[PDB]
Design a protein around this nucleic acid. Structure first.
Ligand SMILES: [Zn+2]
Ligand SMILES: [Zn+2]
Lengths: 146, 144
DNA sequence: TGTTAACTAGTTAACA
DNA sequence: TGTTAACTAGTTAACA
C-alpha cells in the first residue's frame, strides 16, 4: 500500500488532524500561556506590521468579515487592540495594537519563523537537483485545489 | 524559496478545508446533501455495522459530534438501529436502502479523488516519484 | 457509552 | 464595509 496516490491522501489526512480544528500550521505551542486563538494571534502579528481595516484583515486571512468582527471584539476585551472611530474627516475604522500586544506579536512572529526554519531544516537535506523536483510537485498539487 | 512554498502549500489546504475534516476534489455528487462527515459515516457503515464510539474512533472526532451526525442521518431515514447479539444494551447502526447509493457515491468521490491524485503523480517519472514520496514521509515527522 | 447543554470559531444574509 | 442575527458542525464536561 505504498502507492503514490495513497501516500498523498494519507498526508493530507495527517495534516488535517495535526491542525486539529484551527486554521494554520505551526510547530510547538505558543510562548504565551494559552492566550488567544491562532487567528487572533495572527491578526495581532498583522497589526504590528501594518495597521488595517476589517476588510483588509478579512482578505489577508481568507475568512469572512463577520469572523473578523468577532475576533476583534474579543481582542478588544483583552485590551489588546484599539479602534480609531471614523470621527475625523477619516470615516475609516483603523485598528492598531496596544503596548500589551507587541510582546505577543513578536511571540507569534518568531513562532512562524521557527516553523519555517524547521521546513528549511527539512529542505536543504535534499540535493539542489532533488529540491527543484519537490517545488514542481507542490506546484502541481496546489493546482488541484484550485 | 522552498520552505515558503511548503508553508504556502499547507496554507492553501487549510483554506480548501474550511470546516471539513477530510479533503476531496470536486463537489459531492450525492442525490442528498449532507455534511461530508455525514456522508463519510454512511460509507463507513457500508463496510461494517458499527457503534457510535467506533465511528468516533474512525473519524477521530468526538462521540457528541457523532450523536449529532447520526441524528441528522436518522432524520432523513438513512440509518436504523439494531442491538448486539452479545449484549442487548449495545446499539449498532446500519444503512437503510435509501443509503446504499449515497455510501456508494461517497466511496466513489474518494476514488475519483484518488484517480485525480494518480494522474498527477504519473506526470513525474518513477525516478522522481520515490524521491517525492520520501519527501512526504520526511515531512510527516514534524506532525508524527 | 452515548446524551445533553453550554460553548466555540467559523458561515451566510440583511441592512445602514 | 462591517455589525449583527441566525446559523453550523464541531468541542469539553457532566452524568443518565
Ligand atoms: Zn499565524
Ligand atoms: Zn470521506
Amino acid at each position: 500500500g505504498m502507492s503514490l496516490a495513497n501516500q498523498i491522501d494519507q498526508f493530507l489526512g495527517t495534516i488535517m488532524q495535526f491542525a486539529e480544528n484551527k486554521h494554520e500550521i505551526l510547530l510547538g505551542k505558543s510562548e504565551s500561556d494559552v492566550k488567544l486563538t491562532s487567528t487572533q494571534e495572527h491578526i495581532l502579528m498583522l497589526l504590528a506590521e501594518q495597521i488595517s481595516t476589517n476588510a483588509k484583515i478579512a482578505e489577508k486571512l481568507k475568512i469572512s468579515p463577520a469572523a473578523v468582527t468577532k475576533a476583534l471584539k474579543k481582542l478588544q476585551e483583552q485590551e489588546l487592540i484599539k479602534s480609531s472611530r471614523a470621527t475625523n474627516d477619516e470615516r475609516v475604522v483603523l485598528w492598531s495594537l496596544t503596548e500589551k500586544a507587541v510582546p505577543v506579536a513578536k511571540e507569534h512572529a518568531t513562532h512562524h519563523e521557527k516553523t519555517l526554519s524547521t521546513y528549511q531544516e527539512l529542505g536543504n537535506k535534499f540535493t539542489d537537483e532533488e529540491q527543484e523536483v519537490i517545488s514542481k510537485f507542490l506546484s502541481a498539487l496546489t493546482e488541484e485545489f484550485q
